[PDB]
């Protein structure tokens, strides 16, 4: 039947309350179900959340749980997928092209009627609130935030009995940030999309004063915190003249501004919460490359008795491309797959390679692109060595600057060059 969007603001009790409700009425419904969770870490906890019922986390169940990216990848690689009666889709405004992809691909299926879906999220796609309501009153700061190491100044960081979370827009400002704290005595974690199994679990087990993040938080994390420090930046991707480049500080959404913000009052009793915030925030994102690779995406997904699906209705603005634009051959198909799925290269960069008609074993295409595409970090080239042992400096023929745009990328991209993978 329906598409229901269901906007409960953070602390509402989405995974605690309101989803075991849903999941609860859905079994006793006797609907095939799939619980869409944005990450690994999030599908972790909303399985603890649902102990007692019969939940197939990827005897007998009518109720499957995956991550958003894990589900449209399945898609991508035709290997078959539940015909199932209701998808919930977990922090459905997530921008991951995966995520994307997956709401154009579910509001198709209800669409033709096949099933109905649920989408959750405090901010729903197509609004725009960055000051959402919260369990307790926030106390909205606006200030001066720096952006890098300081000698002085910004006493009102330092001269705070309680715990805060400091987003930043890369690891290397969170590095620079967090020392800076160090040295003024605070006991800090750091927080990364590497570094969360392992340092997450210490919000808790240990004390600290300070978490730095990237916007690996923005979801996925419950603190017990008292304030939030957020100069709303990032850094993103953008395509254009035939090569993605990495752009920022730029303001960040007002979605993100909001879960960032929701980190702080969700507990009803405790009055003092703040959100320490500058800069303003922005919904003119369509030169992001997201929305091009959500259709890259989409546009090698069959659906079954239907034609290519577009993307979820109030995002099919962020898009000039025509439907099948990006299609592709079969055995081109299954390379796009692979160098995303096991290479782990960005949509983007995948596809072109794909669509070049490179095999997915031949790694030259890293090596033999214009002197123009020669990779540059800490302003030196990156030698590598291939399998046989050779002298090669990375230099692709498709320029994709999330390649070097951190050092996690940069040693999956130099493994990937290498024939790792």
Same mark, same amino acid.
């Given at each position: ?5 269901? +906007?409960? /603001? ?22 095939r179900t799939v619980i869409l969770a944005p990450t690994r870490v999030v599908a972790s906890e909303t399985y603890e959340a649902l102990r007692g019922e019969p939940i197939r986390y990827m005897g007998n169940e009518i109720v499957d749980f995956m991550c958003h990216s894990t589900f449209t990848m ?10 199932? @009666? ?10 991951? =092209? ?26 729903? =796609?197509?609004?725009?609130?960055a000051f959402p309501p919260s369990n307790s009153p926030i106390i909205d700061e606006e200030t001066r935030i720096p952006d890098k190491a300081w000698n002085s100044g910004y006493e009102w960081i330092t001269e705070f009995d309680g715990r805060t979370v400091w987003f930043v827009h890369s690891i ?100 003092? +919460? ?10 003119? @994102?369509?030169? /992001? ?10 546009? @090698?997904? /069959? ?57 997915? /074993? ?5 090596? +033999?692109?214009? @002197? ?50």
């Amino acid at each position: 039947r329906e598409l229901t969007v269901l +906007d409960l /603001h953070p602390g509402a009790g989405k995974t605690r309350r309101v989803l075991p409700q849903l999941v609860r009425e859905a079994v006793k419904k006797r609907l095939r179900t799939v619980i869409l969770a944005p990450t690994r870490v999030v599908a972790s906890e909303t399985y603890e959340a649902l102990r007692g019922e019969p939940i197939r986390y990827m005897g007998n169940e009518i109720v499957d749980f995956m991550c958003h990216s894990t589900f449209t990848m399945k898609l991508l690689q035709g290997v078959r997928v539940p015909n199932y @009666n209701l998808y919930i889709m977990d922090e459905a405004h997530f921008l991951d =092209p995966a995520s994307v992809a997956a709401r154009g691909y579910i509001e198709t299926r209800v669409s033709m009627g096949d099933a109905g879906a649920i989408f959750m999220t405090a901010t729903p =796609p197509g609004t725009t609130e960055a000051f959402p309501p919260s369990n307790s009153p926030i106390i909205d700061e606006e200030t001066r935030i720096p952006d890098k190491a300081w000698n002085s100044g910004y006493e009102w960081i330092t001269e705070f009995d309680g715990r805060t979370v400091w987003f930043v827009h890369s690891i290397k400002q969170g590095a620079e940030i967090g020392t800076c704290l160090q040295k003024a005595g605070k006991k800090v974690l750091y927080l990364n999309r590497k570094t969360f199994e392992s340092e997450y679990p210490k919000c808790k087990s240990e004390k600290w004063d300070f978490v730095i993040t990237t916007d690996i938080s923005e979801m996925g994390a419950n603190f017990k915190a008292d304030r939030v420090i957020d100069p709303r930046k990032t850094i993103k991707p953008i395509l254009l003249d035939g090569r993605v480049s990495m752009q920022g500080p730029i303001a960040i959404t007002p979605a993100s501004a909001a879960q960032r913000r929701g980190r702080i009052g969700r507990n009803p009793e405790k009055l003092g +919460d703040i959100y320490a915030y500058s800069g303003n925030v922005s919904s003119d @994102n369509e030169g /992001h490359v997201s929305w091009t690779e959500a259709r890259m995406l989409l546009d @090698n997904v /069959h659906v079954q008795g239907g034609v290519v699906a577009q993307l979820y209705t109030p995002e099919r603005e962020k898009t000039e491309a025509y439907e099948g634009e990006f299609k592709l051959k079969t055995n081109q198909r299954k390379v796009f797959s692979e160098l995303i799925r096991t290479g782990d290269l960005p949509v983007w960069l995948a596809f072109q390679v794909a669509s070049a008609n490179v095999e997915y /074993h031949d790694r030259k295409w890293c090596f +033999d692109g214009p @002197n123009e595409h020669l990779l540059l970090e800490n302003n030196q080239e990156i030698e590598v060595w291939t399998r046989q042992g050779q002298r090669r400096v990375l230099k692709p023929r498709w320029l994709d600057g999330r390649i070097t745009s951190d050092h996690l990328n940069l040693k999956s991209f130099k493994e990937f060059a290498s024939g790792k993978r």
